[model samples]
Target: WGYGQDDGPSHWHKLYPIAQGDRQSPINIISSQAVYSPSLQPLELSYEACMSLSITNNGHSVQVDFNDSDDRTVVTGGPLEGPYRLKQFHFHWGKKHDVGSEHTVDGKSFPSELHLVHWNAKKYSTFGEAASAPDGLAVVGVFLETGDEHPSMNRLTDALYMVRFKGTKAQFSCFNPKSLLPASRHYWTYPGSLTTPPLSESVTWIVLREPISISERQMGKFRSLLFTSEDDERIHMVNNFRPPQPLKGRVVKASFRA
Candidate 1:
């Protein structure tokens, strides 16, 4: 992840070519334009308290990989055709606060954004295979606004110091991701692609409308992550988010009324 203009998103597209495909993700959700749908069901998430295997710098962002061998932690309902297994969750924050989310509302953005990635294990057999097919993944997006100090998130933030350098992965366990979400289930829905590489257009976006609380101090902790390890030149892992993509004429649906 370094966002080198031509190489990262554009150049890599030559291989996947699905890059310029329609229904791309990280699009702007204009509230007024979104049509509220009564048929949309509430997002059902069952992320039972589980172990967080390790947290890695990953160069793109600080990704906390999960142990997804079983079907215990899964997401269903909402816009999903069936249950999807939770694979991992990561964040997208700015070098500083105020600008690091992939999707925004009304031409606006929150301080940061959180992506909970899940794959259709039931339909495809494996995440690697599901990731390439259309309608293979469902990602829950939650916006993080800087304000009061986040309480539960501190459990992970405090551990960031150990995995600061890129490629460095430290042990972190028994942290449930449910603590990171907002109380509201209302969200905007659309078909989109992976914001990162491979850029597969297989994701069903369920972005929460309500934003969660974080603090300026907590935001500073995110900037402490280094993109390069001790061997390479140290680069702050700030601005680890892709810019929002074009809507490509796709309409966004809301689970709740304005």
Candidate 2:
């Protein structure tokens, strides 16, 4: 389904009933309510051998696929039992500069959001299998706010023109996603799901407290992408994010104390 007025988040539950499930994703993170947990370890990410294969406009978002044949690029620690291999990464943005990110902090929305999707390689045989299990997937979320131009961000934004339309893809190799991350590792962890369809309650959400900078000009390139195919009527791909779901009594744990 599309993110239109007739088939948006509100209508998602009609097909994917789990959209209303207790552990659904993109919940509003209230800093005051988050419990600081000394038990939570610092996050460890190894990307020296990470390989970017291709970038595609999947009609939903611009996704960069990764080579996950081995444990070359994996995330460990921080509420995780074992290493989670990087599968792919994508972005969600808005039409304007104020409303794009799926998960909000203190009810505040960012201009965009980044999701680095990983699957537990120690426990699951495949990404599909892990996506259906309780602790199968780990998603690192980073918010994007408008500020001074981010030089590293240009690497991704520069390739947007190649995949301006849905179903388009380009050879986007040697692009390490680590460059997109912020300086701090402090984050809030919680139990959540895929922000999109199937909405599996399988994700361990690790949302970074610090946001990365993105110029308004770079965000414009994202908005220029088309939701429809090249042959179809050009519909700008914007606002491709799910709104924050209810907390449902779930406790959010913070890795650092203010």
Top candidate (TM-score):
2
> Which stretches of model 1 miss by more than 4 angstroms?
5-16
> Candidate 2, residues 196-241: lDDT per residue as tens digits?
9989999999999999998889989999999999999999999999
Highest lDDT against the true fold, candidate? 2
lDDT of all the models against the reference? Answer: 0.84, 0.92
Per-model TM-score, in order, reads 0.95, 0.98
Q: What local lDDT does model 2 show for residue 53?
A: 93
Q: For candidate 2, give the lDDT of residue 83.
A: 91
lDDT of 1 by residue, 105-138 (tens): 8888777899999999887988989998888999
- Report clash pairs, candidate 2: none
Q: Lowest-lDDT window of 10 residues in candidate 2? A: 41-50
